[PDB]
């Protein structure tokens, strides 16, 4: 999902590449370092956002996400969720989902 | 603003939280089965309860999103399972007492045993003890002692525990707006929301009953042939138009007749196909057994196995220090982690079982891209059906000669294949009557059509009419036959085995039409053919996200189950059995009994 004019959860709600982006991409398997026995929750992500992030925009706001019109006020409940979610990391996970 | 947006939001966050707890719950069971330790036994309960209570907590929020305002089919299917409250609908007492009955009935099954009448000191448990002895036992009294005495302390003692299981489970179906508990299992086939593909729950009783009528002419000939070979042993108790004893079926419950293949061999003067002696000379181990099967899925176009799959496999049991269950099982946890726990010896069955155990893993790879709640087979019969089509292709002499197991000069003719069809017929044609018989009985008892006193009266009354089996010793309503069965005592679906036979054969006939194979069906081999894999891969990745009636049309082109592929694959055997039964009477009568003369 990382590329000019892409879509998806991580692209829209986390990191997006503008259509004119001239840079490059590099990735390698971290399963031998990040992933450990029992799981590593230190690496999280933003699951829900009221809209799509703009090009080269970073928002760390932890404010609760409101799905409907039901007030939240920072208290989890019906139609109220916590946007940040932790990536499950263990060495037994499939290569496709390896960090 | 609309409930649709709120429903999809609840479903997106549910897959992530459920995938983490579900993976840890299944991972805990893996370490418990691979190694028996005090730490793994507790981890399975903690991880199992954490995931079990997760659905109970999510079910409360799932009932707050009615499905009437959701116009998406994929959204309602995900919430269809979450809308169910499980045991929450039951009363506090009925909810807690239900687990006690399941654990009590399951404990007596494993702890149940029958002491040797001749050796009161030695007392052998049913599994393996009672299941192994009854397999090769040719004695009339030896088989009757363990078969008759088991249900005395089991069937009779499990009757009060089974009665509660019937009343408790019914309260759950009524709270779910189901006609009865019997309709609860039929809900797996329920199809609604698509015009023209709708499948009613009650339609299953008519399909299973309508398709069984066409199997009668094939089973009647197969039953008359088995009774002719065994008629010389006991002509008094075995009548020509009567039924065969219930304890002579070859095992405890008479589920599979494969054990009788030895004495039922039509031709003993010709060799049989076996890879045991061939693999020994080739010097192959469990490491190369799975590797040879992995190349088979690649020939049809299916992706290979991940590196972690073959590295984490368990090829044997390292003694009693670290012990595991040798029962072949395909464990799918999540996050791309696939493993198989089996004890791998050198045999012709392990090679065929390798393709079956790998079929489940290969089947889980197609729909793995679907949501957590959308990852599953279209029904309960497609799980083991997709794995049987792979084993049927390996048992063909063409596939064995390809890799070099069977000699290239081996003569293949009618005498050679006729003996092979009989071996597969006992395991296939033998389970069908027993499956429709036992499954139909549970639906009648749960529906309330059979009073408590007629449970056993209707059990054997319908047994001679369906499978044509009579009881040597008459039993009263105290005994419970299904109570001793594994699936009946463990609260598992017993109907999935009947439909598996019709589904595995439909794909066999459809996949062979894409590969353009000619000749008999049992001669077909899907290896080296990449056209059949592309057609089956479409449905493999669909899972239960789409109605099984629609997905089945894209493969075999049928909207329901059909027995036609059952007659063609068994056609060569039916033509031969019809001639051998001319001197005997085809069929049986329900008015004959071994104790009634």
XYZ file of C-alpha atoms in Angstrom:
696
model
C 0.000 0.000 0.000
C 3.048 2.314 0.019
C 3.197 4.149 -3.319
C 1.910 7.277 -5.098
C -1.877 7.386 -5.030
C -2.448 4.262 -2.943
C -5.251 3.207 -0.596
C -5.866 0.935 2.384
C -5.697 1.263 6.144
C -1.981 1.987 6.556
C -1.873 4.277 3.512
C -4.871 6.485 4.316
C -4.900 6.326 8.125
C -1.138 6.085 8.740
C 1.291 7.028 5.954
C 0.589 7.991 2.340
C 2.750 8.790 -0.685
C 1.841 11.751 -2.918
C 1.419 11.091 -6.623
C 4.515 13.212 -7.335
C 6.716 11.451 -4.758
C 10.131 10.934 -6.367
C 11.708 8.916 -3.546
C 12.376 5.213 -3.108
C 11.158 2.405 -0.848
C 13.231 -0.065 1.177
C 12.084 -2.934 3.387
C 13.541 -6.034 5.016
C 12.271 -8.729 7.361
C 12.532 -7.727 11.028
C 11.176 -11.029 12.386
C 14.680 -11.794 13.704
C 14.761 -8.619 15.832
C 11.415 -6.930 16.500
C 9.340 -10.102 16.837
C 9.999 -11.908 20.121
C 8.466 -14.715 22.152
C 5.178 -13.679 23.735
C 4.557 -10.836 21.291
C 5.691 -7.213 21.079
C 2.983 -4.561 21.460
C 5.380 -1.590 21.392
C 4.590 -1.045 17.684
C 1.003 0.148 17.186
C -1.046 1.741 14.412
C -4.070 3.979 13.887
C -7.002 1.776 12.884
C -9.750 4.409 12.547
C -9.781 8.057 11.503
C -12.558 10.465 10.567
C -10.936 10.929 7.137
C -7.858 10.066 5.069
C -4.504 11.569 6.005
C -3.011 14.199 3.717
C 0.303 13.694 1.893
C 3.234 13.776 4.322
C 1.023 14.229 7.389
C 1.624 12.720 10.834
C -1.081 12.787 13.522
C -0.293 11.272 16.929
C -3.628 12.308 18.469
C -4.955 9.534 20.717
C -8.466 11.022 20.912
C -11.150 8.340 20.946
C -12.773 7.624 17.583
C -16.531 8.232 17.386
C -18.226 5.924 14.887
C -21.754 7.291 15.289
C -23.420 10.274 16.926
C -23.265 8.774 20.426
C -21.038 10.954 22.647
C -17.811 9.351 23.855
C -15.932 11.821 26.103
C -12.837 9.615 26.215
C -14.765 6.723 27.804
C -14.814 3.527 25.759
C -18.244 2.109 25.035
C -20.903 1.705 22.374
C -19.827 3.445 19.148
C -16.604 4.498 20.906
C -13.276 2.808 20.178
C -9.558 3.353 20.711
C -7.909 4.068 17.340
C -4.394 2.838 18.130
C -3.835 -0.913 17.781
C -0.716 -2.984 18.440
C 0.919 -5.175 15.802
C 1.161 -8.779 16.946
C 4.819 -9.819 16.619
C 5.971 -13.394 17.232
C 8.526 -15.543 15.376
C 5.873 -18.198 14.654
C 3.788 -15.824 12.518
C 3.578 -16.293 8.770
C 6.129 -14.696 6.478
C 3.415 -12.531 4.936
C 2.572 -10.890 8.267
C 6.164 -10.789 9.527
C 7.140 -7.222 10.497
C -24.683 8.070 10.340
C -26.424 4.906 9.171
C -26.122 1.648 11.094
C -24.168 0.196 8.160
C -21.163 2.419 8.876
C -21.360 1.512 12.570
C -21.621 -2.209 11.782
C -18.615 -2.205 9.445
C -16.627 -0.299 12.078
C -17.428 -2.903 14.739
C -16.443 -5.647 12.292
C -13.102 -4.048 11.394
C -11.947 -3.684 15.009
C -13.278 -7.161 15.850
C -11.032 -8.993 13.378
C -7.875 -7.462 14.863
C -8.730 -8.081 18.521
C -10.102 -11.549 17.729
C -7.082 -12.537 15.624
C -4.670 -11.898 18.506
C -6.659 -13.787 21.147
C -7.621 -16.594 18.755
C -4.004 -17.146 17.696
C -2.820 -17.366 21.308
C -5.682 -19.725 22.183
C -4.804 -22.101 19.339
C -1.076 -21.717 20.021
C -1.625 -22.797 23.630
C -3.371 -25.971 22.459
C -0.441 -26.709 20.135
C 2.148 -26.689 22.926
C -0.247 -28.832 24.975
C -0.690 -31.497 22.288
C 2.952 -31.529 21.167
C 4.185 -31.645 24.778
C 2.282 -32.722 27.892
C 3.292 -30.493 30.808
C 1.717 -28.714 33.759
C 2.425 -25.360 32.091
C 0.728 -26.229 28.793
C -2.363 -27.683 30.487
C -2.943 -24.388 32.303
C -2.087 -22.211 29.296
C -4.765 -24.006 27.272
C -7.403 -23.210 29.907
C -6.331 -19.586 30.392
C -5.932 -18.910 26.670
C -9.078 -20.925 25.964
C -11.169 -19.041 28.518
C -9.802 -15.650 27.449
C -10.931 -16.311 23.873
C -14.172 -18.009 24.935
C -15.103 -14.990 27.063
C -14.082 -12.660 24.221
C -16.969 -13.734 21.985
C -19.308 -13.503 24.981
C -18.253 -9.880 25.507
C -18.510 -9.049 21.796
C -21.874 -10.810 21.466
C -23.434 -8.243 23.808
C -22.458 -5.438 21.416
C -23.335 -7.494 18.319
C -27.048 -7.715 19.172
C -27.213 -3.893 19.139
C -26.802 -3.747 15.324
C -29.974 -5.145 13.718
C -29.497 -6.842 10.357
C -32.649 -5.270 8.884
C -30.844 -1.971 8.198
C -27.762 -3.671 6.691
C -27.960 -4.018 2.905
C -24.519 -5.655 2.584
C -24.442 -9.444 2.309
C -20.855 -9.802 3.537
C -21.663 -7.629 6.563
C -24.689 -9.639 7.708
C -22.774 -12.918 7.405
C -20.065 -11.641 9.754
C -22.677 -10.436 12.258
C -24.806 -13.563 11.750
C -22.423 -15.618 13.895
C -21.802 -12.834 16.422
C -25.541 -12.273 16.888
C -25.748 -15.707 18.518
C -25.328 -15.612 22.299
C -24.299 -19.263 22.602
C -24.990 -20.479 26.131
C -25.851 -16.973 27.371
C -29.497 -17.489 26.393
C -29.657 -20.466 28.761
C -30.401 -20.018 32.448
C -27.573 -19.620 34.950
C -28.145 -23.175 36.183
C -28.802 -24.697 32.753
C -25.775 -22.828 31.385
C -23.342 -24.074 34.040
C -24.851 -27.573 34.192
C -24.434 -27.969 30.420
C -20.632 -27.875 30.618
C -20.768 -30.402 33.466
C -22.730 -32.862 31.316
C -20.383 -32.464 28.345
C -17.318 -32.897 30.559
C -18.895 -35.825 32.422
C -19.947 -37.657 29.254
C -16.574 -36.981 27.617
C -14.715 -38.234 30.700
C -16.604 -41.541 30.845
C -15.831 -42.084 27.155
C -12.066 -41.850 27.656
C -12.115 -43.504 31.092
C -14.630 -46.171 30.065
C -13.337 -49.721 29.775
C -14.551 -53.322 29.627
C -12.740 -55.924 31.715
C -11.896 -59.181 29.960
C -14.537 -61.785 30.924
C -11.918 -64.552 30.856
C -9.303 -62.369 32.619
C -11.094 -60.231 35.234
C -7.730 -58.814 36.328
C -6.884 -57.369 32.903
C -9.194 -54.464 32.026
C -8.669 -52.778 28.657
C -9.923 -49.304 27.788
C -11.989 -48.761 24.653
C -9.409 -46.679 22.774
C -7.057 -48.089 21.663
C -7.724 -51.237 23.664
C -11.281 -52.041 22.615
C -11.020 -50.472 19.146
C -7.931 -52.470 18.142
C -9.106 -55.871 19.401
C -12.485 -55.625 17.656
C -10.764 -54.822 14.347
C -8.933 -58.129 13.813
C -11.140 -60.271 16.078
C -12.872 -63.031 14.100
C -14.530 -64.642 17.133
C -18.288 -64.514 17.637
C -18.185 -64.562 21.446
C -15.006 -62.490 21.782
C -16.569 -59.708 19.706
C -19.911 -59.999 21.516
C -18.383 -59.745 25.001
C -16.714 -56.380 24.371
C -19.549 -55.125 22.150
C -22.405 -56.145 24.460
C -20.720 -55.358 27.790
C -19.599 -51.863 26.740
C -23.093 -50.382 26.407
C -24.130 -52.087 29.662
C -21.996 -49.853 31.892
C -21.779 -47.063 29.285
C -25.005 -46.901 27.295
C -27.060 -47.572 30.420
C -25.116 -45.167 32.643
C -25.005 -42.449 29.965
C -28.796 -42.528 29.526
C -29.475 -40.121 32.437
C -26.587 -37.905 31.320
C -27.861 -38.011 27.729
C -31.399 -37.069 28.781
C -30.099 -33.847 30.334
C -28.074 -33.190 27.178
C -31.299 -33.389 25.161
C -33.310 -31.090 27.439
C -30.477 -28.606 27.996
C -29.561 -28.211 24.322
C -33.220 -27.766 23.351
C -33.540 -24.728 25.625
C -30.700 -23.095 23.679
C -32.343 -23.627 20.283
C -35.702 -22.312 21.506
C -34.036 -19.155 22.835
C -32.423 -18.739 19.392
C -35.823 -18.888 17.631
C -35.086 -22.367 16.259
C -37.694 -25.092 15.846
C -35.547 -27.462 17.931
C -31.958 -28.467 18.641
C -31.919 -30.700 15.562
C -32.461 -27.657 13.353
C -29.503 -25.990 15.094
C -26.967 -28.108 13.205
C -28.892 -27.727 9.937
C -28.302 -23.972 10.197
C -24.806 -24.460 8.781
C -26.389 -25.101 5.371
C -28.864 -22.224 5.777
C -28.667 -19.827 2.820
C -30.583 -16.542 2.744
C -30.165 -13.082 1.243
C -29.522 -14.125 -2.380
C -32.425 -14.431 -4.803
C -32.835 -17.966 -6.131
C -29.983 -19.471 -4.091
C -31.926 -19.475 -0.808
C -31.662 -22.832 0.975
C -34.085 -23.570 3.804
C -32.974 -25.468 6.894
C -35.831 -27.963 6.568
C -34.813 -28.774 2.986
C -31.844 -30.785 4.293
C -34.083 -33.574 5.610
C -35.572 -34.000 2.130
C -32.229 -33.859 0.299
C -30.490 -36.413 2.527
C -33.578 -38.632 2.327
C -33.990 -38.192 -1.437
C -30.328 -38.843 -2.260
C -30.219 -41.923 -0.019
C -32.875 -43.614 -2.166
C -30.467 -43.788 -5.115
C -27.698 -45.258 -2.941
C -29.874 -48.232 -1.924
C -29.280 -50.248 -5.138
C -25.525 -49.754 -4.733
C -25.491 -50.542 -1.004
C -27.884 -53.492 -1.310
C -25.495 -55.210 -3.726
C -22.487 -54.353 -1.554
C -24.283 -55.753 1.503
C -25.342 -58.986 -0.214
C -21.748 -59.600 -1.319
C -20.358 -59.112 2.193
C -22.999 -61.450 3.640
C -22.150 -64.185 1.119
C -18.477 -64.417 2.099
C -19.315 -64.454 5.824
C -22.332 -66.757 5.395
C -20.186 -69.904 5.593
C -19.027 -69.035 9.119
C -22.454 -68.906 10.817
C -25.295 -69.998 8.510
C -27.768 -70.239 11.406
C -27.460 -66.647 12.639
C -26.816 -65.238 9.139
C -29.885 -65.572 6.900
C -29.677 -65.147 3.111
C -32.465 -62.538 3.112
C -31.680 -61.414 6.672
C -29.167 -58.975 8.116
C -25.579 -59.274 9.293
C -24.722 -59.231 13.013
C -24.040 -55.813 14.500
C -20.766 -56.853 16.168
C -19.293 -58.396 12.989
C -19.094 -55.070 11.112
C -15.321 -55.106 11.739
C -15.127 -52.535 14.550
C -17.042 -51.334 17.603
C -19.709 -49.167 15.946
C -19.475 -50.584 12.419
C -18.677 -47.181 10.926
C -16.139 -48.403 8.345
C -16.006 -51.858 6.754
C -12.392 -51.502 5.568
C -11.379 -54.033 8.234
C -13.366 -56.662 6.296
C -11.435 -56.011 3.069
C -9.122 -58.917 3.930
C -11.800 -61.620 3.734
C -13.810 -59.744 1.077
C -10.987 -59.664 -1.507
C -12.619 -60.752 -4.793
C -9.345 -62.098 -6.231
C -6.590 -63.368 -3.956
C -4.427 -64.720 -6.777
C -3.397 -61.238 -7.945
C -1.077 -58.744 -6.223
C -2.343 -55.533 -4.659
C -0.915 -52.025 -4.896
C 1.157 -51.182 -1.815
C 3.833 -48.505 -1.394
C 5.079 -49.873 1.944
C 7.665 -52.252 0.484
C 8.449 -49.776 -2.307
C 9.117 -46.853 0.044
C 11.337 -49.014 2.266
C 13.696 -49.843 -0.600
C 13.641 -46.182 -1.650
C 14.699 -45.250 1.915
C 12.304 -42.374 2.535
C 11.562 -40.611 5.823
C 8.898 -38.240 7.124
C 10.922 -35.284 5.827
C 10.660 -36.373 2.179
C 7.080 -37.659 2.504
C 5.606 -34.166 2.818
C 8.081 -32.744 0.297
C 6.809 -35.155 -2.363
C 3.223 -34.088 -1.642
C 4.103 -30.384 -1.818
C 5.089 -30.820 -5.473
C 1.612 -32.216 -6.188
C -0.172 -28.994 -5.221
C 2.267 -27.049 -7.406
C 1.428 -29.172 -10.460
C -2.216 -28.046 -10.220
C -1.305 -24.369 -9.757
C -1.744 -24.118 -5.987
C 0.985 -22.197 -4.122
C 3.656 -24.151 -2.278
C 4.102 -24.351 1.504
C 5.802 -21.604 3.484
C 9.221 -22.195 5.022
C 7.826 -22.045 8.554
C 5.302 -24.767 7.725
C 7.862 -27.484 6.971
C 10.232 -26.296 9.715
C 7.624 -26.421 12.503
C 6.115 -29.774 11.497
C 6.141 -32.640 13.998
C 7.303 -35.828 12.283
C 7.197 -38.256 15.232
C 6.792 -38.613 18.994
C 10.106 -38.382 20.905
C 9.325 -41.178 23.336
C 7.291 -40.802 26.502
C 9.335 -37.861 27.836
C 7.652 -35.497 25.359
C 4.418 -37.083 24.126
C 1.920 -35.936 21.507
C -1.323 -37.207 19.997
C -0.688 -39.272 16.863
C -4.217 -38.573 15.609
C -3.702 -36.723 12.296
C -5.025 -33.173 12.535
C -4.570 -29.950 10.562
C -4.148 -27.016 12.957
C -4.828 -23.523 11.588
C -3.945 -20.805 14.117
C -3.538 -17.518 12.269
C -1.135 -14.864 11.041
C 0.046 -17.245 8.323
C 1.154 -19.890 10.844
C 0.260 -23.379 9.585
C 1.308 -26.611 11.286
C 0.397 -30.302 11.305
C 0.858 -32.700 14.235
C 1.015 -36.358 13.202
C 3.120 -39.441 13.896
C 4.732 -40.358 10.572
C 5.558 -44.013 9.934
C 6.314 -45.792 6.654
C 3.022 -47.099 5.255
C 0.787 -46.796 2.216
C -1.867 -45.039 4.323
C 0.454 -42.375 5.755
C 1.320 -41.345 2.196
C -2.381 -40.983 1.386
C -2.991 -39.319 4.758
C -0.180 -36.843 4.063
C -2.126 -35.441 1.108
C -5.271 -35.260 3.254
C -3.605 -33.509 6.195
C -1.888 -31.166 3.736
C -5.174 -30.564 1.913
C -6.583 -28.816 4.976
C -3.526 -26.552 5.171
C -3.594 -25.934 1.418
C -7.319 -25.181 1.710
C -6.700 -22.629 4.476
C -4.246 -20.718 2.260
C -6.845 -19.697 -0.344
C -9.323 -17.941 1.968
C -6.634 -16.747 4.405
C -7.092 -13.270 2.888
C -10.688 -13.168 4.156
C -11.708 -11.577 7.471
C -11.386 -13.568 10.681
C -15.131 -14.229 10.886
C -15.161 -14.950 7.131
C -12.378 -17.573 7.312
C -14.023 -21.006 7.202
C -15.457 -23.647 4.889
C -18.772 -23.039 3.166
C -20.176 -25.810 5.387
C -19.076 -28.604 7.722
C -18.657 -31.086 4.858
C -16.156 -29.110 2.789
C -13.424 -29.315 5.448
C -12.622 -33.003 4.917
C -14.041 -33.135 1.377
C -11.307 -30.964 -0.150
C -8.721 -33.234 1.478
C -10.225 -36.471 0.166
C -10.051 -35.424 -3.495
C -6.288 -35.071 -3.025
C -5.923 -38.554 -1.525
C -8.103 -40.151 -4.210
C -5.705 -38.813 -6.854
C -2.669 -40.321 -5.108
C -4.243 -43.779 -4.755
C -4.592 -44.025 -8.540
C -1.917 -46.246 -10.144
C -1.096 -43.407 -12.556
C 0.084 -41.067 -9.789
C 2.079 -43.774 -8.001
C 3.926 -44.757 -11.185
C 4.754 -41.091 -11.840
C 6.945 -40.622 -8.751
C 8.309 -44.168 -9.035
C 6.568 -45.968 -6.165
C 4.847 -48.584 -8.338
C 6.817 -50.487 -10.953
C 6.200 -49.184 -14.502
C 5.456 -52.728 -15.731
C 2.646 -53.294 -13.213
C -0.365 -54.693 -15.060
C -3.534 -52.620 -14.610
C -6.764 -54.363 -15.618
C -10.269 -55.095 -14.341
C -9.081 -57.668 -11.796
C -6.650 -55.095 -10.382
C -9.093 -52.173 -10.226
C -12.111 -54.234 -9.125
C -10.224 -55.081 -5.932
C -9.378 -51.396 -5.429
C -12.966 -50.168 -5.799
C -14.146 -52.650 -3.161
C -11.625 -51.284 -0.655
C -12.842 -47.725 -1.258
C -16.498 -48.801 -1.301
C -16.409 -50.196 2.242
C -14.958 -46.929 3.558
C -17.336 -44.836 1.421
C -20.470 -46.901 0.798
C -20.141 -48.282 4.323
C -20.256 -44.946 6.143
C -23.189 -43.527 4.151
C -25.945 -45.803 5.556
C -24.502 -45.589 9.072
C -24.269 -41.796 8.773
C -27.822 -41.258 7.516
C -29.074 -43.787 10.077
C -27.496 -42.256 13.186
C -27.887 -38.642 12.049
C -31.573 -39.121 11.225
C -32.211 -40.753 14.611
C -30.810 -37.766 16.512
C -33.065 -35.408 14.550
C -36.134 -37.455 15.514
C -35.267 -37.742 19.217
C -34.426 -34.042 19.517
C -37.541 -33.066 17.547
C -39.711 -34.992 20.019
C -41.170 -37.550 17.603
C -39.712 -40.531 19.513
C -40.751 -40.888 23.181
C -37.992 -41.540 25.694
C -39.063 -45.188 25.976
C -38.849 -45.761 22.200
C -35.268 -44.474 21.838
C -33.858 -47.997 21.532
C -37.027 -49.476 20.014
C -36.726 -47.061 17.081
C -32.921 -47.333 16.951
C -32.765 -50.990 15.899
C -36.117 -50.812 14.094
C -34.665 -48.175 11.760
C -31.252 -49.882 11.671
C -32.369 -53.043 9.867
C -34.319 -50.900 7.390
C -31.423 -48.511 6.679
C -28.127 -50.360 7.173
C -29.695 -53.818 7.501
C -28.150 -54.702 10.866
C -29.850 -56.621 13.681
C -28.896 -56.805 17.352
C -27.778 -60.221 18.655
C -28.919 -59.357 22.201
C -32.143 -57.306 22.442
C -31.872 -54.100 24.456
C -34.418 -51.989 26.319
C -34.738 -48.199 26.494
C -32.059 -48.083 29.213
C -29.167 -48.584 26.791
C -28.070 -45.673 24.599
C -26.130 -46.574 21.456
C -25.128 -43.027 20.371
C -23.977 -42.267 23.925
C -20.873 -44.406 23.351
C -20.061 -42.828 19.977
C -17.232 -40.300 19.854
C -19.060 -37.554 17.952
C -22.347 -38.039 19.822
C -20.695 -37.802 23.245
C -18.449 -34.869 22.267
C -21.302 -32.783 20.782
C -19.865 -32.751 17.257
C -21.749 -32.677 13.967
C -22.388 -36.201 12.673
C -24.068 -35.078 9.432
C -20.874 -33.591 7.965
C -19.660 -37.112 7.134
C -22.672 -37.916 4.938
C -22.441 -34.802 2.755
C -18.657 -35.220 2.492
C -19.165 -38.290 0.293
C -21.407 -36.443 -2.172
C -19.218 -33.323 -2.270
C -15.887 -35.119 -2.721
C -17.269 -37.090 -5.677
C -18.826 -34.054 -7.372
C -15.461 -32.274 -7.398
C -13.770 -35.461 -8.622
C -16.065 -35.591 -11.660
C -15.874 -31.837 -12.306
C -12.108 -31.468 -11.866
C -11.491 -34.369 -14.264
C -13.601 -32.701 -16.962
C -11.339 -29.638 -16.845
C -8.176 -31.745 -17.158
C -9.694 -33.608 -20.143
C -9.107 -37.112 -18.787
C -10.817 -40.021 -20.541
C -11.874 -43.414 -19.241
C -13.239 -44.507 -15.871
C -13.332 -41.949 -13.083
C -11.066 -43.894 -10.717
C -8.412 -43.796 -13.460
C -8.437 -39.982 -13.448
C -5.392 -38.181 -12.054
C -5.265 -34.418 -11.488
C -1.455 -34.298 -11.373
C 0.404 -32.351 -14.061
C -2.926 -30.689 -14.927
C -2.902 -26.955 -14.182
C -6.381 -26.299 -15.611
C -8.283 -28.093 -12.837
C -6.415 -26.228 -10.099
C -7.418 -22.804 -11.406
C -11.111 -23.745 -11.313
C -10.958 -25.161 -7.777
C -8.861 -22.249 -6.488
C -11.756 -19.845 -7.096
C -13.950 -21.560 -4.501
C -11.042 -22.321 -2.156
C -10.523 -18.608 -1.451
C -14.255 -17.907 -1.059
C -14.802 -19.934 2.110
C -18.120 -19.284 3.830
C -18.210 -15.606 2.809
C -20.543 -16.685 -0.018
C -23.462 -19.148 0.034
C -22.245 -22.712 -0.419
C -24.958 -23.171 -3.056
C -23.425 -20.421 -5.199
C -19.806 -21.506 -4.712
C -20.755 -25.096 -5.567
C -22.175 -23.943 -8.912
C -18.838 -22.445 -10.004
C -17.165 -25.864 -9.613
C -19.565 -28.711 -10.428
C -22.284 -26.458 -11.848
C -24.927 -27.818 -9.463
C -27.146 -25.932 -7.022
C -27.512 -28.863 -4.595
C -26.237 -32.344 -3.798
C -26.511 -35.084 -6.415
C -25.802 -38.822 -6.348
C -24.914 -39.048 -10.063
C -21.131 -38.851 -9.425
C -21.593 -41.612 -6.839
C -22.971 -44.060 -9.414
C -20.344 -43.341 -12.081
C -17.252 -43.678 -9.879
C -18.736 -46.873 -8.405
C -20.243 -47.924 -11.758
C -17.533 -50.510 -12.618
C -17.997 -52.082 -9.181
C -21.795 -52.079 -9.464
C -21.682 -53.964 -12.771
C -19.459 -56.669 -11.269
C -21.385 -57.004 -7.998
C -24.671 -57.351 -9.899
C -23.427 -60.536 -11.580
C -21.947 -62.074 -8.423
C -25.245 -61.492 -6.578
C -27.377 -63.319 -9.163
C -27.025 -66.561 -7.189
C -28.040 -64.718 -3.990
C -30.866 -62.378 -2.987
C -30.228 -58.652 -3.423
C -31.453 -56.775 -0.356
C -32.485 -57.712 3.160
C -35.647 -58.037 5.242
C -36.492 -56.360 8.546
C -38.570 -59.295 9.855
C -35.534 -61.501 10.599
C -33.744 -61.544 13.955
C -30.958 -63.772 15.306
C -32.855 -64.489 18.545
C -36.272 -64.789 16.837
C -36.881 -68.057 14.986
